[PDB]
Each structure stands twice: as structure tokens, then as C-alpha cells.
Design a binder for this molecule. Structure first.
Ligand SMILES: [Cl-]
Ligand SMILES: [Cl-]
Ligand SMILES: [Cl-]
Ligand SMILES: [Cl-]
Ligand SMILES: [Cl-]
Ligand SMILES: [Cl-]
Ligand code: NA
Ligand code: NA
Lengths: 121, 123, 123, 121
């Protein structure tokens, strides 16, 4: 729990997540996607339970990335919600929502949902 | 635009969102929830598109709140993904995911999904 | 109750849902969508709790529509999960998932999520 | 595509799905869950694209199960939306929504979301 979130993680698509977990609940770092209208690293910010468990539970966390950087602006943002489980093979299991900015006419089809599993391998 | 988003907003459950949109695309503030094992204000952090399209398209954004403060700890975190629509009646329409920490065993039932609409209060 | 659900309903996008709830918990009917690459009516099938609680709790149900009929094929399917609330103004509040067939390559972007509220029409 | 959906599939939790895909788009069968306030088989009904692809795409499908049978009534329903991909190792990749019947007071927390991958192994 805690500390252990800090590091570089990769998900099944090959995207890389580099985070620092702060003693009080903050999550800061950068994200580089392997898919999308993404190009380079994007800033990410989130929050986690700094006091999880003590039944063998995971540590709830979440973070956001607005897909805009010095190279591209996809006019979308993705949020990942999930939990961290440490151990010999630590992982972060997440479900994400990706919203694109649309006109009201296309608001019904603005959000994609998926799931990503990140490991340090 | 940072401004448009900066302000106090409320949603249909009676919760309060106080946010400041920074020039760099950052979102920081506090959230007061009307439901759940929540008590007092919680810190929120998010990101938004500081350069949206010039299209009556909404401005994409998202933020997270881990439900732990100095008074309560619910061992859960919520992320909201949506867009801000400005105008006379500005709104932030979102869909959210609430994940609870659980044992591997109950992980299948760790996440709730819903939707919230926030209305800005200002004269 | 089967009845309560049986009828014609419309949602905020202007789509039409005609359903019959059978005694065994079955749902069958047709759906007319106001959006997407849809044209005409599509067949729908679902299930609902034919023995709900006796609690002003809603009646859980869900249904699917694959968007293929004799006129169009969008190579996608939508499932709606929600509950029916009866009363003077009966409503079915749902959250839906729309999955498109894609290549493994674009599977990450195969599913959309949203929410729909249906209002029953009847005098 | 088509036909190939018919059979017995299992997901990572150990739940079993037995379906018959009908020439015109219907999906019928039974489901036995490994988790929840479930007990025995429950009836399931759905729809699939009977005419998918011709770029190597999967076959979109979805189905519902109301968790009520002769033994238990959990007052909930689950819908799975996803696509079938056949081949040497066929699978059905899905995301699901589980709604429980609640009073309006708890409507905000009525729906769970997850993902399941089913194989014939
Ligand atoms: Cl990614
Ligand atoms: Cl992306
Ligand atoms: Cl809230
Ligand atoms: Cl519709
Ligand atoms: Cl299952
Ligand atoms: Cl279940
Ligand atoms: Na809330
Ligand atoms: Na629709």
C-alpha cells in the first residue's frame, strides 16, 4: 500500500505511467499513450487513499490526463479509477472513461469506457 | 476557458464542488458530497483542455476525489469525466466511476458508475 | 410487474421503445433510435425481475438491441441496464453500453457508455 | 463469426455461459455465476450481428440475465456488451453493468460496472 505506487508502470497497450505518490494522498507524474491522437508525455494528477486495510484490501486511487501537450490537443480527457495491490507482482487494476469535447448533437456519443491493468513489467 | 470553470457548482444530489482552473490546464479545489460515507470537504485535483475548439463543443475535463480527509476515510475514490458547456446556464455534464478498496475476492464488485450534472452558481 | 413495463416509452433523444414484459421475466419488442446509423425498427430482447420487492424499490431489468435489421447493419449492439419505477409518471432509468465490432487494434475504443431515461406514454 | 458463438464459455471468475446463436441474431441460453447472490442457472437472452467483417473485425453482441430463478431472487440484472472474435483461441470480450433495484434514495449507487473475458477453456 502507499509508497509502492511510486514508479513506472505499463499497461497492456504499452502506454507508460510514471507517478509519485505523496504522503498525504496526491498522485503526480506523466503519461505517454500507445494509442490515440496522443504524441509525447502528458501531465497527470490524481489522488489515492494514503491510509488504506489494514483484510488485505487494495488501495483505491484515480487520476486524470487532459490530452493536450505542446505537440497535440485531442480535446479529450481520460480518468482512470481503480485500486493498487502490491506484493511480489504489484498491479493497478482500472476502468477508465474517455470524454471528447462535442457539440450537444454528439454529446450522446462523447464517452468511451474501458479497463487497463498496469504492472511494473 | 479557465475562468468559465472556476467557481462554485452543485449537482442534483446536493453536493458542492469549488474549483479553480489554472492556466496550465490544472484543476484544484474541494468537494463536499451529499451522499456516501463522506463528512466535510475533500481535496480534488483534475485537468481540463485549456485550448478547447472555437465549435459550440464542450471543454473536456476530469477530476478525482479520494474520500479521505481528517475526519473520515471511506477507502474509495471517485473520478468524474465530462465536459463543460458555457453560456447563460453553464453546466458540467459528467459520468463517474467510484472504486472502493476490496479484497481480490470482491474486486468484481468494487466499482460503481453513474452520472452527475453540475450547475454553476454565480450572479 | 409485467404490465407496468409493457407499453410504449420514449427517451430524451426522441427514440421509441415498444415492449411486452412476459410472465416468465422476459422482455421482447422493437426499438426505433433517433441517433446513430440506425433506420427503421430493430428487435429487442431482455429480462426483468418479475418478483420485485414490496419497498418503493425499482424493478431491475435490461435489454439488448444489435443494430442490424433488413435495411441497415451498423455492426454494433447496445445493452441497457436500469430499473423501472412505477407511479403516476412511470420511468425506466438506464445506463447503456454500445459496443462496435472492430479490429483487435481498435478494440480499446469499441465501447461507448451513456444514460437514458424513458417516460411511458399512455392515457 | 456467426455459428462459433454457440457453445459453453467460461469467464475468469469461473462463471459458465451456455449459448445458442440463431441464424437471424438471437442469443439464448443459461448462465451460472461463480459470484454474487446467485444460485443455479439463470436464463439469458441477447442479440448479436448475424452479418458482421468482412477488415478482421469482431462480432458485436450483448445479453441480459435478471438474477431471479427458482432458488434465488437478488432483484438485480446484469447486461454484458462486447464482441466475439473467433480463431484458434476464440473469446468474447465484454464490459457489463449490474443494476440492483433500489429506492430513489440509493439510486446513485445502484449500478456496478466491470469487464469479463470468456473463453471455451
Ligand atoms: Cl493507455
Ligand atoms: Cl487516447
Ligand atoms: Cl456528489
Ligand atoms: Cl436511443
Ligand atoms: Cl459472472
Ligand atoms: Cl451476480
Ligand atoms: Na457523489
Ligand atoms: Na440511443
Amino acid at each position: 500500500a502507499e509508497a509502492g505506487i511510486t514508479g513506472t508502470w505499463y499497461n497492456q497497450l504499452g502506454s507508460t505511467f510514471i507517478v509519485t505518490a505523496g504522503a498525504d494522498g496526491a498522485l503526480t507524474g506523466t503519461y505517454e499513450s500507445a494509442v490515440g491522437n496522443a504524441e509525447s508525455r502528458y501531465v497527470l494528477t490524481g489522488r489515492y487513499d494514503s491510509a488504506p486495510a489494514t483484510d488485505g484490501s487494495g488501495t483505491a486511487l484515480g487520476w486524470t490526463v487532459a490530452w493536450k501537450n505542446n505537440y497535440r490537443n485531442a480535446h479529450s480527457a481520460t480518468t482512470w479509477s481503480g485500486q493498487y495491490v502490491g506484493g511480489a507482482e504489484a498491479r493497478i487494476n482500472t476502468q477508465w472513461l474517455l470524454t471528447s469535447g462535442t457539440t450537444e448533437a454528439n454529446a450522446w456519443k462523447s464517452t468511451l469506457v474501458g479497463h487497463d491493468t498496469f504492472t511494473k513489467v
